[PDB]
């Protein structure tokens with residue numbers, strides 16, 4: 034993340050760090066995601082679609098830093114990884130970018146909702162906070178685009194929400210965000226998401242409740258005058274999310 038602050042997990046008690054295991058050479062960070070209910074995490078197919086053998090991922094909850102074992106984490110396999118039956122990578126733009134992972138400790142069970150391990154609620158149907166709401170993102174994403182290492186502490190930032198007519202400024206993303214893709218960014222240029230963040234959460238405040246408003250997906254550069262980060266628009270997906278759940 035190219036924005037504000039370094040945080041710790043208990044301000045993010047739903048974050049999901051997902052790792053690939055390798056043939057021999059060990060384990061590299063895939064993406065974030067978010068804890069749904071002790072059996073489930075939510076993220077984006079673009080992360081896994083090239084490499085779909087559920088058995089190579091190792092996701093974590095309660096982990097606070099890329100390569101250090103933080104206080105009281107729990108480790109996970111992924112009993113099933115479910116990718117959207119319809120996904121597509123158009124130039125820059127991603128489509129129906131959503132995915133589910135059923136975790137399972139080495140023991141067969143979903144996770145124990147600790148202090149450092151909460152669910153976050155899904156949105157309700159046709160109710161997304163309005164342009165100009167500040168929401169927040171978490172990930173271990175590049176700090177600077179020019180960087181080729183992801184940061185070693187976790188990062189969080191907050192980011193204002195854009196309206197589809199504004200984000201379809203042809204000076205922005207044209208007809209390529211669409212009704213199910215949600216733009217947001219800090220009034221231009223300075224904080225934003227980036228690489229290896231997608232699958233992270235966009236968590237807006239609705240009535241009182243932190244609510245999984247959107248899932249990070251794409252954006253042309255990180256922190257660019259006229260280039261919003263776009264985030265999947267979660268309420269358009271609550272059917273699929275229950276009928277593959």
Ligand SMILES: Nc1nc2cc(O)ccc2[nH]1
Pocket residue numbers: 225226227228229230231249250251252253254255256260261262263
């Ligand atoms: N603005 C923005 N650029 C991004 C690039 C990514 O690979 C993932 C999220 C992003 N958000």
